[PDB]
Amino acid sequence: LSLHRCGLPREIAIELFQTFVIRGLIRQHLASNIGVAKSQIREKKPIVWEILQEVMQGHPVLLNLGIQSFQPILVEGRTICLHPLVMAVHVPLSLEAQAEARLLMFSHMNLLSPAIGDPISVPTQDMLIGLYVLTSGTRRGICANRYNPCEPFFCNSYDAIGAYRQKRINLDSPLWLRWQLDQRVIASKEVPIEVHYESFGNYHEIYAHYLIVRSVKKETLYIYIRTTVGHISFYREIEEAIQGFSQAC
Amino acid sequence: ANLVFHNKVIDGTAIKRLISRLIDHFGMAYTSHILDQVKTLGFQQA
Amino acid sequence: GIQRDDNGRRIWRRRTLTKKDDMLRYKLQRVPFVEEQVRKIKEVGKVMTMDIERLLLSEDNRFEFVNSVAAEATEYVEKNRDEYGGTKKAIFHVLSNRVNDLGFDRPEAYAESDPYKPGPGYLKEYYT
Amino acid sequence: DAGYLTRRLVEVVQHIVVRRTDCGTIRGISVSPRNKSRMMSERIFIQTLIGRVLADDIYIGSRCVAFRNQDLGIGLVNRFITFGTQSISIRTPFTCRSTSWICRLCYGRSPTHGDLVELGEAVGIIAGQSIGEPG
Amino acid sequence: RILGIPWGFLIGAELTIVQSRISLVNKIQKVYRSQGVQIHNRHIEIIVRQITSKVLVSEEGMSNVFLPGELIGLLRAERTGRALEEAICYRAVLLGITRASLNTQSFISEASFQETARVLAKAALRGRIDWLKGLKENVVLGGVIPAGTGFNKGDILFYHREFC
Amino acid sequence: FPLFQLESADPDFYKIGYVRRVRAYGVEFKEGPDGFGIYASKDIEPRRRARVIMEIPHELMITIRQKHPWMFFPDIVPIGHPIFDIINSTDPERDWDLRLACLLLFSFDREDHFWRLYGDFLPAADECSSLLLATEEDLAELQDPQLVSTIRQQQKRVLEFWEKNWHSGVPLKIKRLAEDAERFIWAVSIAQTRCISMKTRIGALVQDLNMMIPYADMLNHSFEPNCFLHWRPKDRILEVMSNAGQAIKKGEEMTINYMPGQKNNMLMERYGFSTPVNPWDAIPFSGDSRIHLNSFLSVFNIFGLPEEYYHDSELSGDDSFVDGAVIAAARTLPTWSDIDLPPIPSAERKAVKELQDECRKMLAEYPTTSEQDQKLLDSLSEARTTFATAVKYRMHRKMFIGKIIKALDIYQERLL
Amino acid sequence: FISTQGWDSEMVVDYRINEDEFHKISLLDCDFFIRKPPDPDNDVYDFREMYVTPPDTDIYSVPRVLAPMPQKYIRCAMSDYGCYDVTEPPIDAPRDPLYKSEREISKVFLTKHYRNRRLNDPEFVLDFEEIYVIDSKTKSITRARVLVTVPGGRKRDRKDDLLVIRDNGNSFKIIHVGERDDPTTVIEREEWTKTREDMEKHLRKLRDFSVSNWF
């Protein structure tokens, strides 16, 4: 479910929205009057459920931040379905009450709590474990090599993710990623471990998490990040979420 | 989008900080969609 | 300043960046794989959520915005009673009208339908 | 015990609503970052300042770094810590010219909405919930 | 014993009230901060304002304006002191949130909170008027509360043509 | 069947703003010999409300408080910088342009500032039309001693400020801002011609600001604009909004009113340009002969109160004659009015004739005519921008006096 | 013009230099000025006159000199040494950036061109035996002590040698280009050394540590 939606059973929805189903039947002349419109609802005539879906759309309900407003959708079964970050159900009748429910009580304009201004819907429990495992990077040092030592290169992040889908690399296996943006990698503020300086003018700066290739002859500046597909996946998910929302709006 | 590239680990206090910065920078409609995507990613990886 | 050469055509210095902006390379790009996400955003009604936030940026008080929308919605229903309550909701019509008044373009009342419905009688069933 | 306290807390301030833009008060509460008897916590002292509206101008030399009726952001507070800002006068619920209502400037920024608190907000009931709920 | 008329009472009440507010907020925030609970001082200051917003007319202050033992607002007492010398003598009093909830401007709010019979008997004997400014008052009456979306009340030229 | 059937600005001009959240809707930036402009890239249909044309984030602007004390929004001057002392030494009333010029030159020196990039699209010293850059020979072509003396005082004030604050002993971080007087004069010219003053609310603080706003300082002036500026406090964005209900055609220039109610000599002193259709321009008449104000307004379909005079273009059909000059004529001509007393035609003809004679006496003060000035502009090949501006100014005033003679001739006949 | 050689190591001078006759080298805590003889490539240095200033200031003083300096003009290639300060600043104003990425330069290396040849010379190589180091923290300039491990001595093919810089720009070793270490190897060596020490420190307090093996 989306954060702003909830699922209602047919048996609960038809009672909550009966007045609107009756009006929809009369408006579209599927029922002659109020008395006939009641019998079709009574007899579960299948045209009732088509109307119920229509009148429910765009009509929020109040569920009792103990009380919030959601956009209901019809679901199969007999239970009320709520999204994991959340019994009385109220249907606003007047347009004034429907405006307040949609514009003041929806679950996306109340993302901050009034106490100190903290976010309300931070991922928890299994969602949090998934992100932790995803972004726990490669093993290091004596946990990575049995002996003291006295990796694949990917042109872009999509090639690295594609190699992971083909089981060519693991989720936490280290890799080098060609980086064609600015240096925006959060890392310890440290000088290079080693600088390899060729006598023709090119020098390689090896940091703990990235390599920078520079020159005293050209203006080149090439960046390779030592990461995992897990870190790439987490970065892509947020970036594609931002780009997807922008394109859709 | 000028998102920083995190490269160490994302625990509970790190995700809470990121959401608050996303809200202040992008607003609540954007962050609400980001939360839905991040929530889906966490469930799938768990 | 004003210069004309031979044939009377004025000649002038075109202004150019003549300077390096590193924000040009890394910002005018695009992600290619968000088609599914974009289509779900419209399906769940998230577009109007951004529109509501857009309208509230032009409002000093969000409570008078709510009252004004309800007042405009009441006028729609009295004017045309039978067109509202089903696929077209009056409050949704008001919001889309107010976005279009800013010069942007939105479908009327954010109403959309499934084109792959296998004929009458069939209800799309939701996977919880 | 938490519900009984929440009911009493809500009852005592249930009538408090943001009813004016500016009560026009002159007084302010003085806050000092460098008390001579105890090293005050920086983060807590910053949190008690973010969102407050200034009651007087603040100067570093001849330069006004923040104006009267300007709300305090994170950037401004860090500037007062960096330089020798000894006293800051803010508008609080203790300075408003009323006990039956509060104005926007004496309340300050809304936490849920980022801007200055809007007219008509039932901030008394919000304060009652914000203390009762963590009980 | 040091200051004179509307200065001993005025300045003495300011010192007591300012000191009380500082210690009350610190004591409350000491409890929540030791348990890791973060609440903005705004919310606590709103409650404490109601606790420390009243003075008690002293037993010797008798006039046709105030009676001894009367509970009056601090701002009202300050303003009357500047304008009159009619034996306006008062001391700051700390009212607990229960006692402050029974000394409001709405007898309807008090009667629906606690001790309904005592509240209504006193109000009925003096013909008390409730102007319904608060929120719970209007909830009882079933009206629209004065907050949120309820705040601030929510033929010549015809038949005179050319014959042609 | 489909088978059988002003240059665009540098693409990087919009892009540097666009990557920093500048949005333009239905308009394009086009460059010509006379400078930049904003034009409707498509037919902008009317709506019930004003349409958003451009959105400019606050962080891309250079703003300073109109009133003391001088605070900068966003605050870019470091504490202790010597540039604040220079800004702080100015006259609070008169030296707003010096304060903005110091901020502008300081901004060009900052690596991260947007105006380091945006400054390359500002007119250069030989392309800016400000009269602060005008030579004494350019001021000789104005034919206006009052305006000339005003400009000379401005040039003297700007120069003396540079000599006082950019002497030999100042730090290098100050010297490198304005190495020469002409560099500082150019900055003041940019400040005068492009500053936009508005009342803004930033957070909880409402104040008047003098603002350097990129991409909105490309809107040209019109006394009948199709756009207006609107500060959006919640997200700190300056909006350019087209007028509600007004249809804008593709290619139409988008304009704002720089200076409501101001004459051409004020437009020349501030922005270094004038318009022939300025509805506020005045002409000194003796007042001996007066025409009927009510008749003159009705003959030309000028409606509204005197301070809101407008032409009902739908009551004239195709009369292109009535424009801002005729409105200016209504406000500047000697007039009488007696509630509803009608004017005698023979007495009004004597006034019209005497007013036309006085109009021709003023045209005879100018050594050349407005046609001879127009062809002088076409014949130019190596003229300074300010020289052409000075000629356009005197020609516009001649065109205005000539329009009055034409309007009086029409009015005298249409009174029958 | 002026020979600062042999002058005080931290005292201010009475005048303000003309900065366009100098190389300006900007570090985190200072600006370093070395006289620039005119040259089309702008890579000739006159070390007889050098100054150091606090950043973005025009108050000049003689830097500390910890090694003998070149007496004649020399051609040098410049490269900086430092780190990236990638932060996440607080978000005060609308659209305040999510991160800020800045470069912090702590050392600058001036590597002599071999025989002072130009960059566009087809026989251009670097002379790694003559490297001068500017340190921002101490506002000093010194010559690097370089260890040569390439066989060939002074007369060798300089096209084959690789300079390795370690230890915060304090250790300089010239190796043969065939002994180049993989960047992964460099990173993994550092991690193995650190985790090996940390693990032993963790295990030291177990009372059977003295009778146990590493494996």
Ligand SMILES: Nc1ncnc2c1ncn2[C@@H]1O[C@H](CSCC[C@H](N)C(=O)O)[C@@H](O)[C@H]1O
């Ligand atoms: N209506 C008008 N007629 C002639 N010049 C105008 C004008 N409106 C604006 N300008 C010119 O535009 C300047 C204001 S800045 C407006 C855009 C400008 N062309 C630029 O390149 O940035 C003024 O100095 C004036 O010279």
Ligand SMILES: [Zn+2]
């Ligand atoms: Zn107040």
